[PDB]
Amino acid sequence: YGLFAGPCKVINAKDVDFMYVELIQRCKQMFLVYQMPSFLQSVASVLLYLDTVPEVYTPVLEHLVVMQIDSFPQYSPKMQLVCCRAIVKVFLALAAKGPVLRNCISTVVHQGLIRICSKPVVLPWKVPTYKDYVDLFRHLLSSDQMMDSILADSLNHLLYDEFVKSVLKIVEKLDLTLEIQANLHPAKPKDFSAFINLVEFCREILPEKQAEFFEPWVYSFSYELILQSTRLPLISGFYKLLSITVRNAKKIKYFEGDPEKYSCFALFVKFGKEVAVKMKQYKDELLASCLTFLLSLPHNIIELDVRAYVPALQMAFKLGLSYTPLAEVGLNALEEWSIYIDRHVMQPYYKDILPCLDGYLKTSFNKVVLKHLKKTKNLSLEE
Amino acid sequence: LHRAGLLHNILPSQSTDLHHSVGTELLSLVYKGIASLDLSCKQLASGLLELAFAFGGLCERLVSLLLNPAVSHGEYFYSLFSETINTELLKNLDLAVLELMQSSVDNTKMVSAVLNGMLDQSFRERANQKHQGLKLATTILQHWKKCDSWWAKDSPLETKMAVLALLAKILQIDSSVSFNTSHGSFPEVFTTYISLLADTKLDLHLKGQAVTLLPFFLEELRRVLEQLIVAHFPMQSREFPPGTPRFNNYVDCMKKFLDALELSQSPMLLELMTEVLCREQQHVMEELFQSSFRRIARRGSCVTQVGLLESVYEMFRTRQSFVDRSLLTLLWHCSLDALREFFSTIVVDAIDVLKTFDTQITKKMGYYKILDVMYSRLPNELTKTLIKLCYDAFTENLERRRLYHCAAYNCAISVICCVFNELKFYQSTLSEEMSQFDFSTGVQRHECMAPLTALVKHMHRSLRDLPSWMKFLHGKLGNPIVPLNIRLFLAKLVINTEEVFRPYAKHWLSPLLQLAASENGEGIHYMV
Amino acid sequence: NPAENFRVLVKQKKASFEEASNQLINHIEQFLDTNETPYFMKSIDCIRAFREEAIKFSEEQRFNNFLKALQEKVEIKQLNHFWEIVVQDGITLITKEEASGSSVTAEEAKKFGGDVDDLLDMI
């Protein structure tokens, strides 16, 4: 019926929405199996066909769509693809009308991330998971291969913009409180967990896409995030998020020190120096975030007072000795800067750089019978 | 400067207090965006919005602007900045409230949209208070009759459910402590409410999902209850196949009613739901029936529980199934203090009735089934005698008669606990905002001997050869001449307990063995 | 609830439809202790409708015997909500209707120790 309603939109068009109405009850009946993607794609088709809709369904669908994210765990991967394609279809159907488009997408992505961060973090109807959706998420932003087929009878950048606006209203919404009763005593640790969930799920979907979509925010977004950083300049999440942001910025090459450009650079250098001098009181899982940020800056801004960046970098390798990714990213930043910045300014602290480079130098079922192995179907520091 | 309390040192009254410089730019820009946009221009237009709000009297102009029918565009402009509109209009006491209350005789969509924006914004307005929302609710309650295009057979079903949703948001916002019975403008909207309940044009599912607000509450109530529910279930719900559309509507409406009553614990609703369920077995999802009873038994005041129990008991006088399916859940779970009150209230009420004929027997089952459970807590002056009046009842030397025997015997097993205690028995920020948004959408092997074994365990707690009749039952089941059904009863019971008589199993092997000898209805090998 | 179902059934395949007979029998019979007198009103109303549809197409004598037998059945139903209500509301039709005569004659015909203890100790 869902694929048939469009032809039915020709003869007995007033029947289409008619049956559509009853389908709403069905999904309400479906509220309280895994047949959700069928509903999603059918309603996507009919709403592509339908042009007149009772607005009472607008919140319901908002409640309905998020449900499938709620049901996304315990899925099989195949109908995960089915439901994600159905999501693409419903978005394309609702994109016809701009107002409903923007408001519905805003509220649904907002509630979705609410439930996503509602899933608690680990510490040492089946039980669901939270890390799955990011795979979903990459398909959400890599969705040209389906919008082309639907346009047969840009938009991912619209998804990118909606996501950026959502995460903006998230980070401005939630604010964290704590006590110490050097010391820490969170007062809303559940909000801490939600925040770190948000960070851990975004700092990977943001960079895999294009900051060219993020460009309308480069000066603004980071600013407020820096603003957020200035609220509690002792939270690792700020450092990770801005680190992803500066990776994206050097990906798009925003550093040419525009008034916004120079303001960005000034805030960057001042805050980087401040954190590079206050790292003294910062420890692991916080000082790690600090150092990973400090190396993540490009050459252009850090040309001023390279010296202040040396010791933490020193630390970033000796602690990078104990934690390989830290040394790895620090080495990438250092080789980058050496390529861009001249040796002369780097010359004085070469006798400083080399001592912290001594690390990584002092070191040294399934039978023959054909079974089309499931292990085959299952699919460091030396570097 | 506005916080410094000055707006005319820099912009005195042009012609009125409305300095239309703000509104002209607002409307021109907000229209020209379609015939272009930016987050930058979004926040700048927001800034212009509070600049307009700094000036006075612009609210009526905004009411006019949102009514722009350019194709739509006025509702579009509202949608772009509904947030600031809510923020300003919350300060607006009822001026634009009356503006809409008059202009809405034709306008239907944007008016309801902005009303819900009002509702959800003032709901978000809770850090200091929600009394602004309460005053707004009272004002619109009075305003209700100044726009009548909805809420009658003058409007379509979509229009009716639109106001249903709006009033539901109001009720979940407003304080039900007032305007639940006669309170000023309460009857004005309440007669409307009752009339809308009578609207048979709406689907019964929609009617139920509307009336789900019933915990906020009188012959009109009950009478509309029967006259609606009669048109739903003829005699049977599972006659409609599971999963078929109308069956799904039935299950939805019944669960809505069950939860709503569970919250409201209104007695007549209890009578109705019990009786409609007390027609056929397990066709009204009797598990949720009893479980919701389990909640409501621990809920409510003891006096309320007592009155509700008396209501259903009087309603009790098939007739037996009425009490059977329902009462025991409450009795086994309601507050022990309320049990004292209710039983003391019905001591002589049951004494007399304790002493065609099938109806008599059914009532007597019920009496035994309520006295036994009431005994189970603690030991008036007459309480002494009634004990005996139970035992004789079993002692009689059509299957309902055997059910009666079991009833009397179980009641005696109960009452023998404390009496004859000796032997010789004479056989969060994130959570709250998530809920705020949920608010915005408004949607989120035969068994008859168990007490016998229980009493066996109890007497084992209080306490080879014994005049516990294990001698008597040992002889009884030792002879094979005892009937097969009786041997089945005895064996199934003794299976559940043998550790009690370990230093008697040295004899128990003898009966069972000859019972095990060529044993011969529900499947012999099971028990074998 | 099955009233309209069997109405459209008997006007869609034109049969006595003993299924419809059992539907109406159930629709009536489940009025013994639960006083569904409004449901009893809808019950008698769908009885009138089915009687009309029966006289219409083919079930004249079918519902003649049906309605007559159910009339004596409710007569022997010694209740507190009984053929009193049927007669006081079935002032139109409570018995057979073939053409006339014997039909309206039928309408007119209906429409208008312990034992020793009880019998002797207090009599």
UniProtKB/Swiss-Prot annotation, chain A:
The compartments listed are: Nucleus; Nucleus, Nucleolus; Cytoplasm, Cytosol
Highest taxon listed in the record's lineage: Eukaryota
For the modification N6-acetyllysine, the affected residues are K367
Fill in the PTM field for this protein. Answer: Autophosphorylated at two clusters, the T2609 cluster and the S2056 cluster. Autophosphorylation induces a conformational change that leads to remodeling of the DNA-PK complex, requisite for efficient end processing and DNA repair.
On subunit structure and binding partners, the annotation says:
DNA-PK is a heterotrimer of PRKDC and the Ku dimer (composed of XRCC6/Ku70 and XRCC5/Ku86). Formation of this complex may be promoted by interaction with ILF3. Component of the core long-range non-homologous end joining (NHEJ) complex (also named DNA-PK complex) composed of PRKDC, LIG4, XRCC4, XRCC6/Ku70, XRCC5/Ku86 and NHEJ1/XLF. Additional component of the NHEJ complex includes PAXX. Following autophosphorylation, PRKDC dissociates from DNA. Interacts with DNA-PKcs-interacting protein (KIP) with the region upstream the kinase domain.
Question: Which family is it part of?
Answer: Belongs to the PI3/PI4-kinase family.
- State the protein's purpose: Serine/threonine-protein kinase that acts as a molecular sensor for DNA damage. Involved in DNA non-homologous end joining (NHEJ) required for double-strand break (DSB) repair and V(D)J recombination. Must be bound to DNA to express its catalytic properties. Promotes processing of hairpin DNA structures in V(D)J recombination by activation of the hairpin endonuclease artemis (DCLRE1C). Recruited by XRCC5 and XRCC6 to DNA ends and is required to (1) protect and align broken ends of DNA, thereby preventing their degradation, (2) and sequester the DSB for repair by NHEJ.
What pathology is it implicated in? Answer: Immunodeficiency 26 with or without neurologic abnormalities: A form of severe combined immunodeficiency characterized by reduced or absent T and B cells, recurrent candidiasis, and lower respiratory tract infections. Some patients show dysmorphic features, severe growth failure, microcephaly, seizures, and impaired neurological functions.
Name of protein: DNA-dependent protein kinase catalytic subunit
Gene symbol here is PRKDC
Range of the intact protein held here: 366 to 850 of 4128
UniProtKB/Swiss-Prot annotation, chain C:
- Kindly list the positions at which N6-acetyllysine occurs in this protein: K68, K73
The compartments listed are: Nucleus; Nucleus, Nucleolus; Chromosome
Q: Where is motif EEXXXDL motif found?
A: 113-119
Taxonomic superkingdom: Eukaryota
Glycyl lysine isopeptide (Lys-Gly) (interchain with G-Cter in SUMO2) crosslink location in chain: K77, K96
| PTM entry text | ADP-ribosylated by PARP3.
Explain the induction of this protein.
In osteoblasts, by FGF2.
On subunit structure and binding partners, the annotation says: Heterodimer composed of XRCC5/Ku80 and XRCC6/Ku70; heterodimerization stabilizes XRCC5 protein. Component of the core long-range non-homologous end joining (NHEJ) complex (also named DNA-PK complex) composed of PRKDC, LIG4, XRCC4, XRCC6/Ku70, XRCC5/Ku86 and NHEJ1/XLF. Additional component of the NHEJ complex includes PAXX. Following autophosphorylation, PRKDC dissociates from DNA, leading to formation of the short-range NHEJ complex, composed of LIG4, XRCC4, XRCC6/Ku70, XRCC5/Ku86 and NHEJ1/XLF. (Microbial infection) Interacts with human T-cell leukemia virus 1/HTLV-1 protein HBZ.
Q: What does the record say about domains?
A: The EEXXXDDL motif is required for the interaction with catalytic subunit PRKDC and its recruitment to sites of DNA damage.
Q: What does this protein do?
A: Single-stranded DNA-dependent ATP-dependent helicase that plays a key role in DNA non-homologous end joining (NHEJ) by recruiting DNA-PK to DNA. Required for double-strand break repair and V(D)J recombination. Also has a role in chromosome translocation. The DNA helicase II complex binds preferentially to fork-like ends of double-stranded DNA in a cell cycle-dependent manner. It works in the 3'-5' direction. During NHEJ, the XRCC5-XRRC6 dimer performs the recognition step: it recognizes and binds to the broken ends of the DNA and protects them from further resection.
Q: Which family does it belong to?
A: Belongs to the ku80 family.
Miscellaneous note, as given in the UniProt record, is: Individuals with systemic lupus erythematosus (SLE) and related disorders produce extremely large amounts of autoantibodies to XRCC6 and XRCC5.
- Name under which the protein is recorded: X-ray repair cross-complementing protein 5
Source organism (scientific name)? Homo sapiens
Gene (name only): XRCC5
Where the shown chain sits in the full protein?
593 to 732 of 732
